[PDB]
Amino acid sequence: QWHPPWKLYRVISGHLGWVRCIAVEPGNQWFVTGSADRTIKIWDLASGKLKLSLTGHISTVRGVIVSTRSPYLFSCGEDKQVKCWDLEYNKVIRHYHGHLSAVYGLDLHPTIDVLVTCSRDSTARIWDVHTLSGHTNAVATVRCQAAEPQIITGSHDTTIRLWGKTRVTLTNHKKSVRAVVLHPRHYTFASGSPDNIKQWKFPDGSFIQNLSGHNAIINTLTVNSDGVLVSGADNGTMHLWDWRTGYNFQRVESGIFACAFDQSESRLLTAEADKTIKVYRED
Numbered sequence: 001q002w003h004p005p006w007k008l009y010r011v012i013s014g015h016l017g018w019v020r021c022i023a024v025e026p027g028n029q030w031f032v033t034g035s036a037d038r039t040i041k042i043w044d045l046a047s048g049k050l051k052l053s054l055t056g057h058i059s060t061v062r063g064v065i066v067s068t069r070s071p072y073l074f075s076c077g078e079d080k081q082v083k084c085w086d087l088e089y090n091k092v093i094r095h096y097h098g099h100l101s102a103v104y105g106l107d108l109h110p111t112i113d114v115l116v117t118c119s120r121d122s123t124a125r126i127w128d129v130h131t132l133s134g135h136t137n138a139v140a141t142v143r144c145q146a147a148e149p150q151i152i153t154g155s156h157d158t159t160i161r162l163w164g165k166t167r168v169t170l171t172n173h174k175k176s177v178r179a180v181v182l183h184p185r186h187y188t189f190a191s192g193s194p195d196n197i198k199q200w201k202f203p204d205g206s207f208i209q210n211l212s213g214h215n216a217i218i219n220t221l222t223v224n225s226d227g228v229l230v231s232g233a234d235n236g237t238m239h240l241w242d243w244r245t246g247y248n249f250q251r252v253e254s255g256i257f258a259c260a261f262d263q264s265e266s267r268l269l270t271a272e273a274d275k276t277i278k279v280y281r282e283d
């Protein structure tokens with residue numbers, strides 16, 4: 001196979017701190033970011049220009065997602081808070097209390113109206129818009145699914161857990177896992193580590209292959225339907241891979257905290273520690 005390499009096309013500034021999270025709204029008209037400057041910002045995707053900015057977290061913003069079935073935006077931050085924003089009204093409308101520590105990330109179930117959070121308190125929690133216990137350290141990322149097992153978490157205990165109980169726990173990683181990605185066809189997924197990015201088959205989590213080579217602190221993993229997998233790390237390096245073969249076909253304060261494709265999958269957006277969002281397309 002063959003993927004054209006990606007190039008830098010835009011740099012969007014405006015935050016005043018590390019950009020930790022990024023998400024694209026389902027209509028592909030705007031995207032939303034969160035930063036250590038404690039603000040949530042919404043930008044038009046075509047112009048890159050700032051549309052709106054929301055405040056309400058008192059700590060770093062670590063997770064964002066725009067609902068696929070609502071007019072709502074959800075967010076979780078290091079202040080242990082998890083909020084429901086109505087940007088049509090541009091304000092918080094609900095709180096989700098229950099985590100005992102900083103909340104690192106979230107994902108939405110495709111059609112059950114549930115929100116899933118992952119926190120430093122080593123648990124994931126489900127929220128109607130349960131408590132998933134068993135991990136022995138911070139859960140850095142969580143992915144939600146349609147079929148069983150619907151919940152996938154990556155923890156600082158180096159383990160993957162397929163879930164209000166765990167079905168599968170996979171211990172193959174030698175370092176703590178910090179990023180997990182689902183493949184849009186939902187038969188395979190991948191887990192990020194400093195030692196290796198590992199590929200697993202749903203639903204029981206069967207190890208497929210090791211994707212070696214990205215020797216850094218992997219903060220983010222994202223893939224599009226064409227099979228282009230993206231890994232961003234705290235040193236600012238980014239490794240592009242072919243999903244099926246596992247080939248690393250391109251290698252491009254500094255650091256990458258979140259990456260996100262747009263709905264067209266022709267744009268790749270990065271949340272970086274230099275306080276900017278960088279947009280890449282294919283050359």
Ligand code: NI
Binds near residue numbers: 095097
């Ligand atoms: Ni409250």
